[PDB]
Amino acid sequence: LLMERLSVDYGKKSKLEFSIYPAPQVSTAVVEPYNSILTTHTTLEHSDCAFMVDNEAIYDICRRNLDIERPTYTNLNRLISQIVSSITASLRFDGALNVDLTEFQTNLVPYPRIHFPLATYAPVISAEKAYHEQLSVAEITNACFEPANQ
């Protein structure tokens, strides 16, 4: 409902979104496939791009990568907050290379319907490993492409 009335009123201004996108085997609710599809038929019309995350994945980041035994939605939200504070950094902190809210659109979006990217962040480990890993740029790059880290 809102994605439209922001169209009608700000025109050509940017619309990005942060979405939890539903889980492969887990469900929080029964009718999730209806509600996603219903929204998505509007997301194709109004959002300029949409950044997706799955709750099922960050659980497994909690088990493998972060090695914490019992992840709550909080151990999970303080994980997402590293994604948001990266995403906005050129708007908030000086740098060698700016990336703006407009520059995601023009580089991720080859057609105004192929506009659902996935997010990842790395590294995402405890001190039990961060004093054994070296943590060079190329390790950290490998650690976002890795299918077990998505």
């Binding site: 080859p110 057609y111 319907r113 192929i114």
Partner: protein, 48 residues
């Protein structure tokens, strides 16, 4: 003393045809139509 084989009063006489039987249900649904489809994320003219 012969009573003339006196009959009962008054019984389940309204049930003598009764069972009763069951009605039916059949659901079963119609297919929606998804034949209004075309893709946009490519080229049909500038490919030439």
């Amino acid at each position: 003393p012969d009573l003339k084989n006196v009959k009962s009063k008054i019984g389940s006489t309204e049930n003598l045809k009764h069972q009763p039987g069951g009605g039916k249900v059949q659901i079963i649904n119609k297919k929606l139509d998804l034949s209004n489809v075309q893709s946009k994320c490519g080229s049909k003219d500038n490919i030439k």
